[PDB]
Coordinates of C-alpha atoms and ligand atoms in Angstrom, one line a residue:
Chain A
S1 CA 4.0 21.1 -9.5
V2 CA 3.4 17.5 -9.4
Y3 CA 2.1 17.4 -12.8
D4 CA 5.3 19.0 -14.3
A5 CA 7.5 16.6 -12.1
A6 CA 5.7 13.6 -13.5
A7 CA 6.7 14.8 -16.9
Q8 CA 10.2 14.6 -15.9
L9 CA 9.8 10.6 -16.0
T10 CA 11.3 10.1 -19.6
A11 CA 11.4 6.7 -21.3
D12 CA 14.9 5.8 -20.1
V13 CA 14.2 6.9 -16.7
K14 CA 11.3 4.5 -16.4
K15 CA 13.1 1.7 -17.9
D16 CA 15.8 2.1 -15.5
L17 CA 13.2 2.3 -12.6
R18 CA 11.7 -1.1 -13.7
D19 CA 15.0 -2.9 -14.4
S20 CA 16.1 -2.1 -10.9
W21 CA 12.8 -2.7 -9.2
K22 CA 12.8 -6.0 -10.7
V23 CA 15.7 -6.8 -8.3
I24 CA 15.0 -4.7 -5.2
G25 CA 11.2 -5.4 -5.4
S26 CA 12.0 -9.3 -5.3
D27 CA 12.7 -9.1 -1.6
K28 CA 10.3 -6.6 -0.1
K29 CA 10.6 -7.6 3.8
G30 CA 14.8 -7.7 3.5
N31 CA 15.0 -4.6 1.3
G32 CA 12.1 -2.7 3.1
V33 CA 13.8 -3.1 6.5
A34 CA 17.3 -2.4 5.0
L35 CA 15.9 0.9 3.7
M36 CA 14.4 2.1 6.9
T37 CA 17.3 0.9 9.2
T38 CA 19.8 2.8 6.7
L39 CA 17.6 5.9 7.1
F40 CA 17.6 5.9 10.9
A41 CA 21.3 5.1 11.0
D42 CA 22.4 7.9 8.4
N43 CA 19.7 10.4 9.7
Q44 CA 19.0 9.9 13.5
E45 CA 17.2 13.1 13.5
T46 CA 14.2 11.4 11.7
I47 CA 13.7 8.7 14.4
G48 CA 11.4 11.0 16.4
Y49 CA 8.6 10.8 13.7
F50 CA 8.6 7.0 14.0
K51 CA 7.8 6.8 18.0
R52 CA 5.0 4.5 17.0
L53 CA 7.3 1.8 15.9
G54 CA 8.8 1.6 19.2
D55 CA 12.8 0.5 19.5
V56 CA 13.8 0.8 15.8
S57 CA 17.2 -0.6 16.6
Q58 CA 15.9 -4.1 17.0
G59 CA 15.5 -4.2 13.0
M60 CA 13.7 -7.2 11.8
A61 CA 12.8 -8.4 15.3
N62 CA 10.5 -5.4 15.7
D63 CA 7.1 -6.3 14.3
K64 CA 5.8 -2.8 13.9
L65 CA 9.0 -1.8 12.0
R66 CA 8.7 -4.9 9.9
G67 CA 5.0 -4.2 9.2
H68 CA 5.8 -0.8 8.3
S69 CA 8.9 -1.7 6.1
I70 CA 7.0 -4.4 4.0
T71 CA 4.1 -1.9 3.5
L72 CA 6.5 0.8 2.4
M73 CA 7.7 -1.5 -0.4
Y74 CA 4.1 -2.0 -1.7
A75 CA 3.8 1.8 -2.1
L76 CA 6.8 1.7 -4.4
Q77 CA 5.2 -1.2 -6.1
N78 CA 2.2 0.8 -6.8
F79 CA 4.3 3.8 -8.2
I80 CA 6.1 1.4 -10.6
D81 CA 2.8 0.0 -11.7
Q82 CA 1.5 3.3 -12.5
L83 CA 4.5 4.5 -14.6
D84 CA 2.5 3.9 -17.9
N85 CA -0.2 6.4 -17.0
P86 CA 1.0 9.7 -15.6
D87 CA -2.7 10.5 -14.8
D88 CA -2.8 7.4 -12.6
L89 CA 0.7 8.0 -11.1
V90 CA -0.3 11.5 -10.2
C91 CA -3.3 10.5 -8.3
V92 CA -1.6 7.7 -6.3
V93 CA 1.3 10.1 -5.6
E94 CA -1.0 12.7 -4.2
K95 CA -2.6 10.0 -2.1
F96 CA 0.3 8.9 -0.6
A97 CA 1.3 12.5 -0.2
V98 CA -1.5 13.2 2.3
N99 CA -0.5 10.8 4.8
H100 CA 2.9 12.5 5.1
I101 CA 1.5 15.9 4.9
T102 CA -0.6 15.0 8.0
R103 CA 2.6 14.1 9.7
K104 CA 4.2 17.4 9.0
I105 CA 6.7 15.9 6.5
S106 CA 8.4 18.4 4.4
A107 CA 9.6 17.8 0.8
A108 CA 13.3 18.4 2.2
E109 CA 12.5 15.8 4.9
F110 CA 11.1 13.4 2.4
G111 CA 14.1 13.8 0.3
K112 CA 16.5 12.1 2.9
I113 CA 15.2 8.9 1.4
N114 CA 17.5 9.2 -1.3
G115 CA 20.7 8.5 0.7
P116 CA 19.2 5.0 1.8
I117 CA 18.1 4.2 -1.7
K118 CA 21.3 4.8 -3.4
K119 CA 22.8 2.6 -0.8
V120 CA 20.4 -0.3 -1.0
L121 CA 20.7 0.0 -4.9
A122 CA 24.5 -0.1 -4.6
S123 CA 24.4 -3.3 -2.4
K124 CA 22.7 -5.0 -5.5
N125 CA 25.0 -3.5 -8.2
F126 CA 23.1 -0.8 -9.4
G127 CA 25.1 2.6 -9.5
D128 CA 24.5 6.1 -9.9
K129 CA 22.4 5.9 -13.0
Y130 CA 19.9 4.0 -11.0
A131 CA 20.2 6.1 -8.0
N132 CA 19.5 9.2 -10.2
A133 CA 16.4 7.6 -11.7
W134 CA 15.1 6.9 -8.4
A135 CA 15.8 10.5 -7.2
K136 CA 13.5 11.7 -10.1
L137 CA 10.6 9.3 -8.9
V138 CA 11.0 10.7 -5.4
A139 CA 11.0 14.3 -6.8
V140 CA 7.6 13.5 -8.0
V141 CA 6.4 13.0 -4.3
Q142 CA 8.4 15.8 -3.0
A143 CA 6.4 18.1 -5.5
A144 CA 3.1 17.0 -3.9
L145 CA 4.3 17.8 -0.3
Chain B
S1 CA -6.5 -12.4 18.9
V2 CA -5.5 -11.5 15.5
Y3 CA -3.1 -14.7 15.3
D4 CA -6.2 -16.7 16.4
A5 CA -8.3 -15.2 13.5
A6 CA -5.3 -16.0 11.1
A7 CA -5.6 -19.5 12.1
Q8 CA -8.9 -19.7 10.3
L9 CA -6.9 -19.2 7.1
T10 CA -6.5 -22.9 6.0
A11 CA -4.7 -24.2 3.2
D12 CA -7.8 -24.5 1.1
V13 CA -8.9 -21.0 2.0
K14 CA -5.4 -19.6 1.1
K15 CA -5.6 -21.5 -2.1
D16 CA -8.9 -20.0 -3.1
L17 CA -7.8 -16.7 -2.1
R18 CA -4.7 -16.9 -4.4
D19 CA -6.7 -18.1 -7.2
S20 CA -9.1 -15.2 -7.2
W21 CA -6.7 -12.8 -6.6
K22 CA -4.9 -13.8 -9.6
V23 CA -7.7 -12.4 -11.5
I24 CA -9.3 -9.7 -9.3
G25 CA -5.8 -8.1 -8.7
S26 CA -4.9 -8.1 -12.5
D27 CA -7.0 -5.0 -12.9
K28 CA -6.5 -3.0 -9.8
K29 CA -7.7 0.4 -11.0
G30 CA -11.0 -1.4 -12.5
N31 CA -11.9 -3.7 -9.5
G32 CA -10.7 -1.2 -6.8
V33 CA -13.3 1.4 -8.0
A34 CA -15.7 -1.3 -8.6
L35 CA -15.4 -2.3 -5.0
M36 CA -15.5 1.2 -3.6
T37 CA -18.5 2.2 -5.8
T38 CA -20.5 -1.0 -4.8
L39 CA -19.7 -0.3 -1.1
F40 CA -21.3 3.3 -1.4
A41 CA -24.3 2.1 -3.6
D42 CA -25.1 -0.8 -1.0
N43 CA -24.2 1.2 2.1
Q44 CA -24.6 4.8 1.3
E45 CA -24.1 5.7 5.0
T46 CA -20.3 4.7 4.4
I47 CA -19.8 7.7 2.4
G48 CA -19.8 9.8 5.5
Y49 CA -16.3 8.5 6.2
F50 CA -15.0 9.7 2.8
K51 CA -15.6 13.3 2.7
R52 CA -12.0 13.9 1.4
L53 CA -12.7 12.0 -1.7
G54 CA -15.2 14.6 -2.8
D55 CA -17.9 13.8 -5.5
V56 CA -17.7 10.1 -5.2
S57 CA -20.6 9.9 -7.7
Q58 CA -18.0 10.6 -10.6
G59 CA -16.5 7.1 -9.9
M60 CA -13.5 6.2 -12.0
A61 CA -13.3 9.8 -13.4
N62 CA -12.8 11.3 -9.8
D63 CA -8.9 11.4 -9.4
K64 CA -8.9 11.2 -5.5
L65 CA -11.4 8.3 -5.7
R66 CA -9.4 6.6 -8.2
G67 CA -6.1 7.2 -6.5
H68 CA -7.7 5.8 -3.2
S69 CA -9.2 2.6 -4.9
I70 CA -5.8 1.6 -6.6
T71 CA -4.0 2.0 -3.2
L72 CA -6.7 -0.3 -1.4
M73 CA -5.8 -2.8 -4.0
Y74 CA -2.1 -3.1 -2.8
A75 CA -3.2 -3.4 0.6
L76 CA -4.9 -6.6 -0.4
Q77 CA -1.8 -7.5 -2.6
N78 CA 0.3 -7.1 0.6
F79 CA -2.1 -9.3 2.5
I80 CA -2.2 -12.0 -0.4
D81 CA 1.7 -12.1 -0.6
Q82 CA 2.1 -12.6 3.1
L83 CA -0.4 -15.6 3.4
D84 CA 2.5 -18.3 4.0
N85 CA 4.0 -16.5 6.9
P86 CA 1.5 -15.8 9.8
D87 CA 4.0 -13.7 11.7
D88 CA 4.4 -11.2 8.5
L89 CA 0.6 -11.4 7.8
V90 CA -0.1 -10.3 11.3
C91 CA 2.2 -7.4 11.5
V92 CA 1.0 -6.3 8.2
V93 CA -2.7 -6.6 9.2
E94 CA -1.9 -4.7 12.4
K95 CA -0.1 -1.8 10.6
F96 CA -3.2 -1.4 8.3
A97 CA -5.7 -1.6 11.2
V98 CA -4.0 1.6 12.9
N99 CA -5.1 3.8 10.1
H100 CA -8.7 2.5 10.2
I101 CA -8.6 2.6 14.2
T102 CA -7.6 6.3 14.2
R103 CA -10.8 7.0 11.9
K104 CA -12.9 5.2 14.5
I105 CA -13.9 2.5 12.1
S106 CA -15.5 -0.3 14.1
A107 CA -15.2 -4.2 12.9
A108 CA -18.8 -4.3 12.2
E109 CA -18.5 -1.2 10.0
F110 CA -15.5 -2.7 8.2
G111 CA -17.3 -5.8 7.7
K112 CA -19.6 -4.0 5.3
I113 CA -16.9 -4.6 2.5
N114 CA -18.0 -8.3 2.4
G115 CA -21.0 -7.7 0.3
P116 CA -19.1 -5.6 -2.4
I117 CA -16.4 -8.2 -2.4
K118 CA -18.8 -11.1 -3.2
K119 CA -20.5 -9.0 -5.8
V120 CA -17.1 -8.1 -7.7
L121 CA -16.0 -11.9 -7.3
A122 CA -19.4 -12.9 -8.8
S123 CA -18.7 -10.7 -11.7
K124 CA -15.6 -12.5 -12.6
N125 CA -17.7 -15.6 -11.9
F126 CA -16.0 -16.7 -8.7
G127 CA -18.9 -18.1 -6.5
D128 CA -19.8 -18.3 -2.8
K129 CA -16.7 -20.6 -2.1
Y130 CA -14.4 -17.8 -2.8
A131 CA -16.6 -15.2 -1.1
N132 CA -16.4 -17.2 2.1
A133 CA -12.6 -17.4 1.6
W134 CA -12.3 -13.7 1.4
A135 CA -14.8 -13.1 4.4
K136 CA -12.1 -15.0 6.4
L137 CA -9.3 -12.7 5.3
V138 CA -11.5 -9.8 6.1
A139 CA -12.1 -11.3 9.7
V140 CA -8.4 -11.1 10.4
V141 CA -8.5 -7.4 9.9
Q142 CA -11.7 -7.2 12.0
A143 CA -10.0 -9.1 14.8
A144 CA -7.6 -6.1 15.1
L145 CA -10.1 -3.3 15.0
Ligands
LIG1 C1 10.5 6.1 -0.7 C2 9.9 7.2 0.1 C3 8.9 6.9 0.9 C4 7.7 5.9 1.0 C5 7.2 5.1 -0.3 C6 7.0 6.0 2.2 C7 5.8 5.1 2.2 C8 5.1 5.2 3.5 C9 4.0 4.5 3.7 C10 3.2 3.4 2.7 C11 3.4 4.5 5.1 C12 2.4 3.8 5.7 C13 0.8 4.2 5.4 C14 0.6 5.5 6.2 O1 0.5 5.7 7.4 O2 0.4 6.7 5.4 C15 4.5 5.6 5.7 C16 4.2 6.1 6.9 C17 5.0 7.1 7.4 N1 6.2 7.9 6.7 FE1 6.7 7.3 4.9 N2 7.6 6.9 3.1 C18 8.7 7.2 2.7 C19 9.6 8.1 3.2 C20 9.5 8.7 4.3 C21 10.3 9.7 5.0 C22 11.8 10.0 4.4 C23 9.8 10.1 6.3 C24 10.2 11.1 7.0 C25 11.6 11.1 7.5 C26 8.7 9.4 6.2 C27 7.8 9.6 7.4 C28 6.6 8.7 7.6 C29 6.0 8.5 8.8 C30 6.3 9.3 10.0 C31 5.0 7.7 8.8 C32 4.1 7.0 10.0 C33 4.5 5.7 10.5 C34 3.7 5.1 11.6 O3 3.6 5.8 12.6 O4 3.2 4.0 11.4 N3 8.5 8.7 5.1 N4 5.3 5.9 4.6
LIG2 C1 -10.8 -4.9 2.2 C2 -11.0 -3.7 3.0 C3 -10.5 -2.6 3.1 C4 -9.3 -2.4 2.8 C5 -8.1 -3.2 2.1 C6 -9.1 -0.8 2.8 C7 -7.8 -0.2 2.5 C8 -7.6 1.1 2.9 C9 -6.3 1.6 2.6 C10 -5.0 1.0 2.2 C11 -6.4 3.1 2.9 C12 -5.4 4.2 2.6 C13 -4.2 4.1 3.6 C14 -4.4 4.7 4.9 O1 -4.5 5.9 5.1 O2 -4.6 3.9 5.8 C15 -7.6 3.2 3.5 C16 -8.2 4.4 4.0 C17 -9.6 4.5 4.6 N1 -10.4 3.5 4.9 FE1 -10.2 1.5 4.2 N2 -9.9 -0.3 3.5 C18 -11.0 -1.4 3.5 C19 -12.2 -1.3 4.0 C20 -12.8 0.1 4.5 C21 -14.1 0.1 5.1 C22 -15.3 -0.8 5.0 C23 -14.1 1.3 5.8 C24 -15.1 1.8 6.4 C25 -16.5 2.2 5.8 C26 -12.9 2.0 5.4 C27 -12.6 3.5 5.5 C28 -11.5 4.0 5.3 C29 -11.2 5.4 5.5 C30 -12.2 6.4 6.0 C31 -10.1 5.7 5.0 C32 -9.4 7.2 4.7 C33 -9.9 7.8 3.3 C34 -9.3 8.9 2.9 O3 -9.6 9.9 3.5 O4 -8.6 9.0 1.9 N3 -12.0 1.1 5.0 N4 -8.4 1.9 3.5

């Protein structure tokens, strides 16, 4: 259940999420596109879900991909900002879950984002400790799908 | 067409947008809900588009409405952050427009948000000057619908 998953966000997990986001969230356009390009490269099977974006291999040059990527980073920003209040984190998570549920994105499918996050984190000197913290946040979303 | 609308965003308009956002965007939950509840109060017909939110009369206490309202404010945060780069502003606005186009929301219907914005701004003491600046930002979105 999403309510139980949200309870997994302990003090130190929230702290690691904030400290890493301070760096990653500094460049939403660059890191956003990096996150999406890595997902498509590591999991080509997911490209089909993004037909609306057009040629995803163009990266930054693709306006729709860039617009999508920047927006994705504001969803993460939203989550980080709601860490203080579990009640608000949950309602924002379920809200965001609806859009993915509508596109028939399962919890297992959503979980594929963990790889790309771990890689982007690593490129900024944030190791496993941080990747695992982010995995916990992603898990909250998975519980709502 | 969206680029042309974005041209109306002059240096003075962008300055008023940023200054007012510094206050309005500081309480996303509070002001986001105030915006939505004012829209419903002044234009009851718009409630027809929000059946998914349920009992919108509960206001802040309604989790779905609260979740939706906080998220709406991050859309504005996104727009405000992209003001200095027309290319990025445009791709984000177009991305956002897709969701409202799919829900058959016309430019005229979308423009009904201008009244609520003016009232929320006035509640924080930002006069007509600021309301006019925000109406121009809204116009960029309308150009995409
Ligand atoms: C960190 C995790 C993720 C975040 C925060 C995220 C965020 C978002 C946001 C904010 C949108 C745009 C608003 C909307 O249309 O609902 C979106 C759209 C979408 N997401 Fe995700 N997402 C994530 C992971 C995934 C994954 C792993 C998949 C599936 C492989 C997925 C599939 C989709 C699809 C298909 C769209 C529609 C794109 C379009 O046609 O414009 N998302 N996502
Ligand atoms: C400043 C103006 C506005 C902003 C920033 C805004 C923002 C948003 C965002 C971010 C979403 C959720 C993500 C998505 O699914 O696309 C959304 C959904 C929606 N918006 Fe807007 N919106 C605005 C004005 C309006 C107006 C005036 C209407 C029309 C009466 C409208 C109708 C809708 C509808 C029907 C949904 C889906 C709600 C749901 O089922 O949860 N929006 N809007």
